[PDB]
């Protein structure tokens, strides 16, 4: 067994291999998530596909359960194993306590799995950040994030990946109460932010909503073509 | 160039225990005050963003019905020590049918705090306050990343720790009441934090001999603020 | 006993340049049939079969452990398996459970792939191989099948008379058994083609 | 200095520096003084604090009814050997139904602490155990050190500024083997006022006394019952 | 030994005797067979006296850790499932345990039945013990879902009295609890020799 | 440099320095001599009084391994009594398995292979102790062995380990240990360790003697007080 | 073959009073048909407010006492106080269950004072179930002592009988008389009666002789 | 030990004024066969304690080996400490109980006599782990035969001299020669005092057969 | 012992990690493999490297490895590291068939191996594999499939991809000549001989220098056919006849 402390302290009180892992998050593709009162809206930007090749194998929005969606950024190799370990714990939770897994419970399993993994021997920490979005029992939509050090943290809106603070500064001046009035109105709140990011000219964007009773539903590039037609049309007549 | 994790200094202390003492100077500040009427215990939150939900983070968390806690420094590895304390108070109730005393909770955690190495991997970078009411009345303890704990009467831990301790030695006396100890703590937190004081940046919790561990919420809390 | 819990009978018989194998079709629990299409002969490559009889659990268990080890053999090596080689492979698999033994008795029949020569053998429940030149039998109604084969076998037989001999050997012996019956399937292989036939037996 | 990194590495002069640095850790803790008569064994400690409102860190611990210890160094390794100390006393009482003798206890500690002073990536135990106890042979004062070398002695003192306490003990140890419990203690209390700055001495909240006695179980006195012992001392001459 | 439990419109009623025997010798008459797991859960004792006392005190430890982590209380169906899994790992080693789990839940009342063999069933009425078959007949007669509270007390009180009259291993006093909305409330504890004068006239 | 950090590396001229560096630590311990007489072995250790505060009879550099086998150590005292524990334990496995008392040619063989085993790996260091083993049997006579920190053992008619090693064994060969019994040896053992260690280096020192042979009936024990007082009476006649 | 158990006799008895507790036992160790010794009491003083009695297989009784007394010292070194009476009875219930599938053949009664200075008596089975009672008898003659104390202490089956609390003087002669009758009929009941009394002052002891068949 | 092959028989022991005396015979039986007729069943532990044993003799040589090493290693420490007889009695009690719990007992029954610090000690140790103290002990059929002769003297006279104790043992060894099929007319008497541990030679009893002429 | 440790697991201060990028640097050189599909059938075109005149030319293949009974793989990189992976997912497909009695889907065979490959990049202090490899195959859920593995541990579905030495030049030409769902398994073969005409600097296209294996779906067969050296060169010259026609007429 390879027994060696990888993550040790600094002479000023920091962790080098943790703050090196946060740089690897900062060059993954941008994922943006907001929440409404009945429908949640989340969608990655910068799909960057070769546009003559396969696309159903490159998806970065999956399902942990029927009520839990999960997007991420960072390096995708360490990401699809955290998902597969999360799909087991939420499935073994049902063999215990009978309810479906609340969105708060599955974030604590991922964050605790990531903290003890910055503690053990011979292990570099994970280089991913994630957004866990779900609608639990009694219909309360909420989301969370997860730092590579393992600090789960709720929000009303979020944006991670490369070009995040450029969106995160844009969202707070853009998040109003009346922006979450309708379902398709909140989708245009996402579409303006990703257009204020890396290019996202309609073919590089991919959104997916959840109406608190359905599974995750990806709209094909016809509604995003329709929404970016009418979000740009409202900007062309206002200015 | 690279030492091991388990090396003494020429001045004799250690390297990474002493480095972890420096790490809790980056955490948010926290104040606990022991009073014979009961233990009051407060913290700031350090809200970063307006889009952030404020109540999702916490620093006060309870261990048992009569013992509260307060964490500083890092947060993600504080939750490991909290879970070991909750299990320890329930094993003591299961085998002895009573409540574990506040001091004996602390040494049950402090034995865990210095156990890293290369067999069986770094010291924990948190600092904790333990407020509780056992059969010797209200208690207030403070542990270390080094695993050294000692009973305090008014301990202030965080980034503004040494600035608050000086302003706290002048107002504390042995015959306080709990109604004025709560007010005396928020005067100190009003000085040291960055943003203005309101009902969302801070939170409190008091433990009493009569009732159990009670955490204040945003309705009964701002009557202290408007009557500061 | 243990072997009498489900019944079963497998017969193999050697011909001129061809070899035939036969088995019954009944699946049941000690008195009570459940179905009449239970598979007991399994293909292991072209021109090489295996028959299993005994406890119904270990019939389906050994036939899947062996296929697990067979496909690893035919990919690590570029060729098909010899009939003599598979006899050593099956005997290794059963002897590993020397004290936890599988309750089955395999029967292997097939043609050697390069020189088309027939091969028959049988094994006990802990792996003692016994090659013969005329016939091998296994199952509950063993003694009835010896009286058939010792009285009917001829040395050099074309595939027409080979089929008629093994058919009368199975139909008369299994009818004398109680826990075996409900139809007989016959595989007769040869170097150019293969033939599966089902016989008109007593459903009694 | 490349010979200054791991416990395994010998110096070219032949002195392992990691052991010599753990001697610096025991010199950081506050002083404590142990001594014995013909029939008693008394050890006296001097506490410290951080602020004036924080409590004072205790140093005298109770191992058994006839053995008590006093620590100096980092407190976490002190409790690591303390829980080893309690365990080795009550199982001998479980097996043989007798008090485990003191001189046979310390040799278990010397074999315990020598092991991490020879492996790779293993620190020594920085601790300052003064041990007082009873065999069937009367009182015993033992000291240890992180070099796993225990010493039989009749009066010693370890901690910060302890050389001044040793000079007091040498010029008065002819009187120690005669006196009763009363001025045996305040012989040792005159050693702790020697190791202090010239303004504060013994203000009844930083000093502790532990006695095991020929018909007396090991007893710790703390900050109120110190005051009968502490009265009856003269003023500091200047 | 005779315990019973039934749920109705106003919560759940739990009753039991108090006699614990040792062969033909009666050890005690004041054994509390309805132990108090929480302020919101109750558990009965049938079969092994120490086997039901241990594994339900171990359950009360486990439910407390669930509340400190999740910041709400465990459901009744989840609490019975934890008990059924801990007992199953000692199957065949000879544990005697036939308890019941009661308590109010977010879905309303809750009533479950846990054996030492691994049975876990819900239901409306249950009766466990050596004299349990004496309790079913008198309880099946006067049971309704729409019973009043004073009528549900006198149903379950007399039903224990009819079981202790026929069974030789049942007797003592009749404990009686009431699981309500907020939590359980102890009703009474009547002696059988006092009820014999009451129910005769 | 870099060729002398671990005990797993040779030098570019083919020797191990971590063993040689641990041999240097022996010459800071004081002096332990032991010679064998015609019918027994007599040890002798001069003991430095470091301060007045220590007790007469402390921290003995002269152990007792088995009922007949004795040990006198020189080196880092923590490693001395650690080697004394395995040698005390090795003789117990011989008597439990083979029935009788262990001979010295086997006992010093099993210990030296245990000392040699730490001169091979990077995970452990070499011991910093050299020591002597002496005994007496009725079927084998007196025996005297000595073990360095490398793991080499030999027989001796008399040996010396400590600070002044050559300055001690220069006067040992002036004696005649082949014919003297272990009574007049005791006076001659003490005398050759008064002439060493000038009073400039140490103020005062302590004599500690040991003793085995058929005069002690095979058992190993310390000398009585009166006999070593005769040797301390025979102390101050070396000024002539 | 080698049977791992044997029955060694013994009879213990406790009574909880208003401010006292009395624990009594005989002093005969015997098995088979023979007498080993005529002096082997069961009054074990745990603290100065708690006395345990241990009947059954005597080899388990010597072991279990030494296990408990180790665990009181481990309590005090970790908590800086002594165990109360209710904490011991809760602890020993876990010790007995810990060997569930190879049990101690021990009967146990713990008699002592609570935090309020009242009497308390706990009674155990060999597996580890318990309850607090007013009086329990345990051992060989337990079936002969329990009905007699239901009459006098419990005041059962009597009409127009008053309810006076048990004075200490009344309870002592009640203990001394009930072992005289048990020595007449049981063959394991011994020769001296070791009575131990737990009050607010301390643990008193008393030895009263019996017949020696 | 599932089945004891070569066994011994009864071992007696009684206190007196300033010491304990223990006697046992010198026969190792094998079923009903007297194979080994010159063995010694008494071990002299160091200077103030003493051990005799019954039951399986191969297990006795094991405990003779283990207790031998526990005395050898302590005396070479130079502590000035030694094991009291009740310290060995407490150790040996734990050794029995910790071994029946593994269902693999030592088939013995052992009597520990000892005189330390001015008083006598006499201890019993059973195979099952049952231990007690008494002024007189007896194992085997001696618990039925010789044990009533021991108690009827010690109740009428609590203190005994050494000559009174030594006379009272040889009477009890005579009775065990008459009424026991596993006895042998060759025994040895061991005695601790303040002076030390002393074991006497193969003594013999004198028998009376005058009733054989009564038809 | 911590002086000799090389720390093949840690991050770099710029955020990325160096060890697998050195491996994917080595995956560029030493080999050329490509695949193509649009219709019924899928092919693997691989170029041989050691073309010395003293070799036996046996084992039915050189860089093609039959994995299941209906799928195969082509490998690139360190050949010795390849032999451990190829007989590792060979029994991943067999332990699936033992468990479910059904042939394994082609996608979740790739994910099973790429988790073993990912683990060495993440803990253990261990040298990762410098091996990237292709995957062809058929299943009943989606038909003909084509995947690509990377030494980091991440896979991807494709339609035509090369991992050669001039693989960027091949991909730039595959997305210059292509048609979605109309390239039959003769036009793809003519396109395959066109692509490795470009990326192979050894000109004139020696028929012994390349290897081509096709996977066609026959009803219950899924025939994996390594086409022999008698029909390569007629497909070589067929590319040569049309290029002299197209150049002269333009």
UniProtKB/Swiss-Prot annotation, chain B:
Keywords: Acetylation, Cytoplasm, Glycoprotein, Nucleus, Phosphoprotein, Proteasome. InterPro entries: Ntn_hydrolases_N (IPR029055), Proteasome_alpha (IPR050115), Proteasome_alpha-type (IPR023332), Proteasome_alpha_type_5 (IPR033812), Proteasome_asu_N (IPR000426), Proteasome_sua/b (IPR001353). It comes from the Eukaryota. Induction: Up-regulated in colon cancer cell lines. Up-regulated in fetal Down syndrome (DS) brain (at protein level). May be the target of the transcriptional activator NFE2L2. It is found in: Cytoplasm; Nucleus. The modification Phosphoserine is found at residues 9, 49, 56. Component of the 20S core proteasome complex involved in the proteolytic degradation of most intracellular proteins. This complex plays numerous essential roles within the cell by associating with different regulatory particles. Associated with two 19S regulatory particles, forms the 26S proteasome and thus participates in the ATP-dependent degradation of ubiquitinated proteins. This is Proteasome subunit alpha type-5. The lineage of its organism: Eukaryota, Metazoa, Chordata, Craniata, Vertebrata.
UniProtKB/Swiss-Prot annotation, chain C:
The modification N6-acetyllysine is found at residue 76. The modification N-acetylserine is found at residue 1. Coiled coil: none annotated. It comes from the Eukaryota. GO terms for biological process: proteasome-mediated ubiquitin-dependent protein catabolic process. Signal peptide: none annotated. Transmembrane segments: none annotated. This is Proteasome subunit beta type-3. It comes from Homo sapiens.
Curated annotation (Swiss-Prot), chain D:
It holds the Pfam family Proteasome. Its main location: cytoplasm. GO terms for molecular function: lipopolysaccharide binding. It is found in: Cytoplasm; Nucleus. Keywords: Acetylation, Cytoplasm, Glycoprotein, Immunity, Isopeptide bond, Nucleus, Phosphoprotein, Proteasome, Ubl conjugation. The modification Phosphoserine is found at residues 107, 174. PROSITE patterns: PROTEASOME_ALPHA_1, PROTEASOME_ALPHA_2. There is a cross-link at residues 112, 205 (Glycyl lysine isopeptide (Lys-Gly) (interchain with G-Cter in ubiquitin)). GO terms for biological process: immune system process; negative regulation of inflammatory response to antigenic stimulus; proteasome-mediated ubiquitin-dependent protein catabolic process. Glycans are attached at residue 107. Component of the 20S core proteasome complex involved in the proteolytic degradation of most intracellular proteins. This complex plays numerous essential roles within the cell by associating with different regulatory particles. Associated with two 19S regulatory particles, forms the 26S proteasome and thus participates in the ATP-dependent degradation of ubiquitinated proteins. This is Proteasome subunit alpha type-1. The lineage of its organism: Eukaryota, Metazoa, Chordata, Craniata, Vertebrata.
Curated annotation (Swiss-Prot), chain G:
Non-catalytic component of the 20S core proteasome complex involved in the proteolytic degradation of most intracellular proteins. This complex plays numerous essential roles within the cell by associating with different regulatory particles. Associated with two 19S regulatory particles, forms the 26S proteasome and thus participates in the ATP-dependent degradation of ubiquitinated proteins. It is linked to Neurodevelopmental disorder with microcephaly, hypotonia, and absent language: An autosomal recessive disorder characterized by microcephaly, intellectual disability with absent speech, severe developmental delay, short stature, and hypotonia. Affected individuals also manifest aggressive behavior and have hearing loss. It comes from the Eukaryota. Keywords: Acetylation, Cytoplasm, Deafness, Glycoprotein, Host-virus interaction, Intellectual disability, Nucleus, Phosphoprotein, Proteasome. It is found in: Cytoplasm; Nucleus. The modification Phosphotyrosine is found at residue 122. Glycans are attached at residues 30, 181. The modification Phosphoserine is found at residues 34, 40, 134. The modification N6-acetyllysine is found at residue 176. This is Proteasome subunit beta type-1. One of its GO terms (biological process) is proteasome-mediated ubiquitin-dependent protein catabolic process. It holds the Pfam family Proteasome. PANTHER family: METALLOPROTEASE TLDD, PROTEASOME SUBUNIT BETA TYPE-1. InterPro entries: Ntn_hydrolases_N, Proteasome_bsu_CS, Proteasome_sua/b, Proteasome_suB-type. Belongs to the peptidase T1B family. The lineage of its organism: Eukaryota, Metazoa, Chordata, Craniata, Vertebrata.
